[PDB]
Amino acid sequence: SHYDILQAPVISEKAYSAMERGVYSFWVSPKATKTEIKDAIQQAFGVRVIGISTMNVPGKRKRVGRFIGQRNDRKKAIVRLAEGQSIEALAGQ
Amino acid sequence: LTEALPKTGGRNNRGRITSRFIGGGHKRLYRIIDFKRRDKSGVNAKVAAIEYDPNRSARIALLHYADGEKRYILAPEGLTVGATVNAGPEAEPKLGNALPLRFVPVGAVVHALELVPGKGAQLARSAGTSVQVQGKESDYVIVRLPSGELRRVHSECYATIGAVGNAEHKNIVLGKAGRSRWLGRKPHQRGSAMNPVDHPHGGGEGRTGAGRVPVTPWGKPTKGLKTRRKRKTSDRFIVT
RNA sequence: AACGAUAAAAGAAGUGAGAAUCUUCUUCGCCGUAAGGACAAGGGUUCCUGGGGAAGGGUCGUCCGCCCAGGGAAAGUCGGGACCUAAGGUGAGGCCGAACGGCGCAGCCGAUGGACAGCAGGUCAAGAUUCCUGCACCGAUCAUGUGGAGUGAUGGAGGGACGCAUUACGCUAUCCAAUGCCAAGCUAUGGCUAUGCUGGUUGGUACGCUCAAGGGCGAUCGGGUCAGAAAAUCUACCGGUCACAUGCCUCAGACGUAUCGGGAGCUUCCUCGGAAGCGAAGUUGGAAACGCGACGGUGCCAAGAAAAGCUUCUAAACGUUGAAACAUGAUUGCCCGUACCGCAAACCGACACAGGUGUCCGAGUGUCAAUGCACUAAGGCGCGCGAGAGAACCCUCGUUAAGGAACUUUGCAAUCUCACCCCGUAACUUCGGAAGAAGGGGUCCCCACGCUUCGCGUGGGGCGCAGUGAAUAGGCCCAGGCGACUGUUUACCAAAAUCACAGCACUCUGCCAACACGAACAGUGGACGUAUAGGGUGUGACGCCUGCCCGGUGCCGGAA
RNA sequence: GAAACGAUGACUGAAUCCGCGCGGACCACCGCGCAAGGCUAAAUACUCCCAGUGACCGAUAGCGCAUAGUACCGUGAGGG
RNA sequence: CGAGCUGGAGAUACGCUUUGACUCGGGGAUGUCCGAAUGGGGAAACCCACCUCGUAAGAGGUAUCCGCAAGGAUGGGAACUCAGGGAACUGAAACAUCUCAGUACCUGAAGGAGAAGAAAGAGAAUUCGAUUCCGUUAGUAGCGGCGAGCGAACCCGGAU
Ligand SMILES: [Mg+2]
Ligand SMILES: [Mg+2]
Ligand SMILES: [Mg+2]
Ligand SMILES: [Mg+2]
Ligand SMILES: [Mg+2]
Ligand SMILES: [Mg+2]
Ligand SMILES: [Mg+2]
């Protein structure tokens, strides 16, 4: 359903300054396509998406321990809203 | 320049090299030629043009049968543009007409000869080749095939009046290796220039030869390669 | 022993426990058809930021492609899929086979090909035809209005549709010049005082009666059904009627106007270097594509994919009272790829390896020309040990008295020759050749005159030892053997007199061909060929020619 | 082999209970059996797994591994 | 079961537990995607569809081979079992029959085992009374380039 899909928001210095222009970034399910991703944001936040762009992201670490490591694997969706922007209070952060 | 099908190159069967040599040459598209000519009986056709058509050695005439159906036909030595042509039993023994051997006079020169009614042309197709009618038997006609052999072709089989076109592959002298390549890959690789392993002639110390054989076992100058088959009855006097 | 190309380095300033090696400034040198820049493959986070300093780094590191943490990768229009077919693969049914399995029509899979809508700028520390700004375009669904009826397959036809060489005209990308314009200042060593010096000198879109090469086109009524399974208003064919030049249709590109952009620099602040704001000029002349106009012209033989999209037809069907199409809104816009390296220290080579790696762009001066050669822009780099010394010997080089092959297996090696223009040129020949034969002369600078220009020709003068003043840069000839010739080969000791070759011959094969692959009465290749063809053997351009022996062996033919 | 009997690819192809098959060419006699239809526990074989034990090992031994089919080599099967 | 627990994980935080946690038995219900793989495609784990129900979310269905259908089959197993096919090195101090050996391997089918089984039999007693297995007969009888070498069965004793 709605409330799943968008796992976490994108932290970073670039997402916070993208916020300041009504552009929101989220880490979503890598299988959750643009239309499904559009709907999920639209409902859960009560706002219309005028544009959506997204892209899949790889992993790969280890600090020590001969455990060669392994990936993590994401998808990052970035949306723009019509003139009356903002999302909750989780935008001013 | 007119419509046809694509003849994609290939020198080996469902696996490996089976017909030795064969490989280079130009692209070449296949042009569908009318060998049967039966389904156009009674309909007259005008020789639109003669054309250079590879895959053959013999010229090709572009025919238009008054019904609208345009067809390619082996152009015979003499046929010019505008000369009308017709097929069937009700058809004159004139340059380019398709008519069974019963209606075909004796000594009269033909080409595009069938072997079984229907099927299509199978004898004297190369340029300059012609079959001359010897004399009718039962429901069979005796003929002189390009090789010199006499065959019993059943009278019911179609033919085309005249000798096949492309004058003579004579002034065509190739000249340079590579004219051969414009067509088929470095042919004749001497078995004496081979190794005992590779071919029976191969080996020894310098230039040689000792028993005369082909690639595999056999022997080549004089050895009847023919089978003891049916077609031998419908045949008279082989040699040459 | 070595520390991986002999493309250098020097100093100052900084940082730090520590500095030849990290940072910054100023020089120096090297590449510049590359050693610059953009992809693809491949790699997989190597990218950016902050930190680290055990190992890795041929030395040292305070640094890194290494170690840790955080971040970065944005698409209706770009490439791929939701479209298409090639080789090939597979393949219900169907053909074969001890099993396993082998084939195989249609169909399906398969790009390296076809098809198809977005251009200009801006800018994170790190993305950009993806984000932002400006203005477009494409399909679909629906709302509105005009239209007032048709729409027009799974099928037909047209179209897609395709070579190699050479080349006429216009153009642009792009490049040069100037006492064209615009901007900034200053220069002084002896001068110049600007007619000097340096830099910049227009992209997208829209409209326009403006200039415009070049490119593309027949139209209509009929007749036969015997052609496209059938039907067709479509297409093929035959015929009638106006098809010379012209005539239509399209405008590469240039010009004008407007507008958005960019633009040399100038400016304000600065936590030491960025950020923000502003913004001049747009000339005349030359050169010029492999790009564009274009599916142009001509010539040639070896005779140059398919299929969908597309356009036109009718079958079936729903329908004419609410069509198709046009127009203006609105809505819609899926999946994967996108960082970074990418002729290399990030790919293949165990190694930060002198090797290999497909495409694209690749500036200026000089030089017939050029992607050659020298120097050089932009840009990138000095090749991850260093410093002394100036022995033997070894390597890569420069010059060399007199002599000039005496060297030696052999002029092996290394010289000599070296570009362009004029003169000149032998035997021999298959009449092409041999030929760059051989040999000689010219070559710079100025001025005058003549002319087809970058130029070149005549004349006079000048300077040096020397004028393709440096770089790129044939030594030549006589006679012989072998092989006619271009070509091919022993990856890693043999390039040849080997193999191949055009040409000649013997011979086999009448087509379900001989022959060959194979479990196989499968299938296939020969061949969608058919004896002026195909198999096999030999000889090996061309000229003159090719003798004697059929006992033995083989092959063909006889049979009492 | 003096080579019967089973089995069967090719070709043939009988008797019906005073019948048929066999008893190691074959014949007699004596003797043992009812083909050309099917089904069927149990004792027997093995050890991925589990338990118990051992004049079995105890880190170059014991499995390849005190756990790894990993690192690493190879295009791959595979090797380790 | 009777106070601990919060997996190796040794690490902090949050917590859960006698209104019985945790762990041990035994059943359920979830169970993405690939894999016989089964809608179609496919370079496994990805791409693209249609049908039906459905409020969108979401749920179910769409392989071929047997059979009216019910219901069965595809694939997987270390070794052991039977079957189709079936080597060579080797031994014979050379080698070709012979040997190695119907072993190794491939392939098919199947199970907890399988195979085989109810006399047109064994064999000489007018004895036995389906099969398999063990002992023994017995290196006997026999086979055999009568060489290397190969090698039964009945009787009898047992498991059943
Ligand atoms: Mg096929
Ligand atoms: Mg030194
Ligand atoms: Mg000293
Ligand atoms: Mg001589
Ligand atoms: Mg030669
Ligand atoms: Mg120890
Ligand atoms: Mg293991």
Swiss-Prot record, chain A:
Keywords, ordered alphabetically: Ribonucleoprotein, Ribosomal protein, RNA-binding, rRNA-binding
Gene Ontology terms for molecular function: rRNA binding; structural constituent of ribosome
GO terms under cellular component: cytosolic large ribosomal subunit
Cell division in keyword set: no
One GO BP annotation of this record: translation
PROSITE patterns xref list: RIBOSOMAL_L23
Described purpose of this protein according to its UniProt entry: One of the early assembly protein it binds 23S rRNA. One of the proteins that surrounds the polypeptide exit tunnel on the outside of the subunit. Forms the main docking site for trigger factor binding to the ribosome.
Assembly with partners or alone: Part of the 50S ribosomal subunit. Contacts protein L29 and trigger factor when it is bound to the ribosome.
Name used for this protein in its record: Large ribosomal subunit protein uL23
Species this protein is from: Deinococcus radiodurans (strain ATCC 13939 / DSM 20539 / JCM 16871 / CCUG 27074 / LMG 4051 / NBRC 15346 / NCIMB 9279 / VKM B-1422 / R1)
Curated annotation (Swiss-Prot), chain B:
Regions of compositional bias (Basic residues) in chain numbering: 223-240
GO annotation terms (biological process): cytoplasmic translation
Function: One of the primary rRNA binding proteins. Required for association of the 30S and 50S subunits to form the 70S ribosome, for tRNA binding and peptide bond formation. It has been suggested to have peptidyltransferase activity; this is somewhat controversial. Makes several contacts with the 16S rRNA in the 70S ribosome.
Keyword annotations of the record: Ribonucleoprotein, Ribosomal protein, RNA-binding, rRNA-binding
Superkingdom of origin: Bacteria
PROSITE patterns on file: RIBOSOMAL_L2 (PS00467)
InterPro entries: NA-bd_OB-fold, Rib_uL2_dom2, Ribosomal_uL2, Ribosomal_uL2_bac/org-type, Ribosomal_uL2_C, Ribosomal_uL2_CS, Ribosomal_uL2_dom3, Ribosomal_uL2_RNA-bd_dom
Family (UniProt): Belongs to the universal ribosomal protein uL2 family.
Gene3D superfamilies reported for this sequence: 2.30.30.30, Nucleic acid-binding proteins, Ribosomal protein L2, domain 3
Subunit description: Part of the 50S ribosomal subunit. Forms a bridge to the 30S subunit in the 70S ribosome.
Region (Disordered): 182-240
PANTHER family, alphabetized: LARGE RIBOSOMAL SUBUNIT PROTEIN UL2M, RIBOSOMAL PROTEIN L2
The protein, known as: Large ribosomal subunit protein uL2
Any matching Pfam family: Ribosomal_L2_C
Species whose genome carries this gene: Deinococcus radiodurans (strain ATCC 13939 / DSM 20539 / JCM 16871 / CCUG 27074 / LMG 4051 / NBRC 15346 / NCIMB 9279 / VKM B-1422 / R1)
GO CC annotation terms, alphabetical: large ribosomal subunit
SUPFAM superfamilies reported in the protein's UniProt record: Nucleic acid-binding proteins, Translation proteins SH3-like domain
GO molecular function, one term: transferase activity
